[PDB]
From Swiss-Prot:
Residues 1-85 form the Glutaredoxin domain. SUPFAM superfamilies: Thioredoxin-like. Belongs to the glutaredoxin family. Monomer. InterPro entries: GLR_AS (IPR011767), Glutaredoxin (IPR002109), Glutaredoxin_subgr (IPR014025), GRXA (IPR011902), Thioredoxin-like_sf (IPR036249). The disulfide bond functions as an electron carrier in the glutathione-dependent synthesis of deoxyribonucleotides by the enzyme ribonucleotide reductase. In addition, it is also involved in reducing some disulfide bonds in a coupled system with glutathione reductase. This is Glutaredoxin 1. Keywords: Deoxyribonucleotide synthesis, Disulfide bond, Electron transport, Nucleotide-binding, Phosphoprotein, Redox-active center, Transport. Pfam families: Glutaredoxin (PF00462). The modification O-AMP-tyrosine is found at residue 13. GO terms for molecular function: disulfide oxidoreductase activity; electron transfer activity; glutathione disulfide oxidoreductase activity; nucleotide binding; protein-disulfide reductase (glutathione) activity; protein-disulfide reductase activity.
Length: 85
């Protein structure tokens, strides 16, 4: 599916979500990922806040096609109990 990482380049934080999503992207031939940045490209915390589900002031965040998962933690966990095959 389409996994999207919306993080803050510069910090070794999104790196985990990208690596995970990426690795998955290769472990499973049906998985693709996208690294989108909030400043580098120009996104607004408002729009994101809206599409994520009011994550107040917490980054980075991961999205899955249409649903929002949360932070790298939720992403790793989500992955574990979803792509365990």
């Amino acid at each position: 599916m389409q996994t999207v990482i919306f993080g803050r380049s510069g910090c070794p934080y999104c790196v985990r979500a990208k690596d995970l999503a990426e690795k998955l992207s290769n472990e499973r031939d049906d998985f693709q990922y996208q690294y989108v940045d909030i400043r580098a490209e120009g996104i607004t915390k408002e729009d994101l806040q809206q599409k994520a589900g009011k994550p107040v002031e917490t980054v980075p965040q991961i999205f899955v096609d249409q649903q929002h998962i949360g932070g790298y933690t939720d992403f790793a966990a989500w992955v574990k109990e979803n792509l365990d095959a």
